[PDB]
């Protein structure tokens, strides 16, 4: 049977980067020709594999993490990068194997009145470990005094909204990102192109 690739790409709503989605795969054949007709222009960078020969590959697990960020920040979705997104929202490992798919979503995710529903984490006492997830909304303690759950000086809400309007520059427009990771369990498979 066919893998639910359209459930990840053709999904109506995408999650915030601080709360990135995660779709488990199992018991299906995976052909990626569906992916090629997805956007007028999109990026398909793979780490250790090529997107063409990757149709002849077998896997035990693939994980599709999807979220929305600025076009400015797609560069941070790569091994060894730094920034608010790589450090405080979504980190890729250095030996990461898999691919990254990103395409402009202005038509879907930006509004003339401004779409403010997509958030990213701005404050964290420590950078994330590769593939770690943090959906907590605790006030960040930036100074000497405790915050008692109240926002103020040295006491900041950790999340901050994107502003997505269609008249912004492309760097500031929303981009939908999908990260494929290739996990190989010591068991048999269900990820082999026809």
């Amino acid at each position: 049977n066919l893998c639910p690739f359209d459930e990840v790409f053709n999904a109506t709503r995408f999650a915030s980067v601080y709360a990135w989605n995660r779709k488990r795969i199992s018991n299906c054949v995976a052909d990626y020709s569906v992916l090629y007709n997805l956007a007028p222009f999109f990026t398909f960078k793979c780490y250790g594999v090529s997107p063409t020969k990757l149709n002849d590959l077998c896997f035990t697990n693939v994980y599709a993490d999807s979220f929305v960020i600025r076009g400015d920040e797609v560069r941070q979705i790569a091994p060894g990068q730094t920034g608010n997104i790589a450090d405080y929202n979504y980190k890729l490992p250095d030996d990461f194997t898999g691919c990254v798919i990103a395409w402009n979503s202005n038509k879907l995710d930006s509004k003339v009145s401004g779409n403010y529903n997509y958030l990213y984490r701005l404050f964290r006492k420590s950078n994330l470990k590769p593939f770690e997830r943090d959906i907590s909304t605790e006030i960040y303690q930036a100074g000497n005094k405790p915050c008692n759950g109240v926002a103020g000086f040295n006491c900041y809400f950790p999340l901050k909204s994107y502003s997505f309007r269609p008249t912004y520059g492309v760097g500031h427009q929303p981009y939908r990102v999908v990260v494929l990771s290739f996990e190989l369990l010591h068991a048999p498979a269900t990820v082999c192109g026809p």
Partner: nanobody
């Protein structure tokens, strides 16, 4: 192998010295990164010469000395298209203009181009 990009050009024709013209180039397909777009040109009998380039995010702009101050390269915010505004065109601007794409995040030099478009004739004369 790791990219497949098509470039569609528009604009060009015949103008007079001092006149203006707007060239456009549209990118489609897939690539490794949101790379740079730009223009080359080739005068009759001469070799191809770099004209202008821009990163995908309209934050970096490069111009050849022969066109600095006269040409301006910009990007559409709703289309995957890049534009070349050509002001005060001179007779030496007469050339076949080629759109070009680099699949890089940073553009060191103009020289291993990844993709071209079909030529676009621009002639400046009376």
């Amino acid at each position: 192998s790791s990219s497949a990009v098509q470039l569609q050009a528009s604009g060009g024709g015949f103008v007079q010295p001092g006149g203006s013209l707007r060239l456009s180039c549209a990118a489609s397909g897939w690539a490794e990164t949101f790379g740079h777009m730009g223009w080359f040109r080739q005068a009759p009998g001469k070799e191809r010469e770099f004209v202008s380039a821009i990163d995908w995010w309209d934050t970096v702009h490069y111009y050849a000395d022969s066109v600095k101050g006269r040409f301006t390269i910009s990007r559409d915010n709703s289309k995957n298209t890049v534009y070349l505004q050509m002001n005060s065109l001179r007779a030496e601007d007469t050339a076949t203009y080629y759109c070009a794409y680099w699949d890089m995040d940073y553009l060191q030099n103009s020289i291993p181009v990844d993709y071209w478009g079909q030529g676009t004739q621009v002639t400046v004369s009376s």
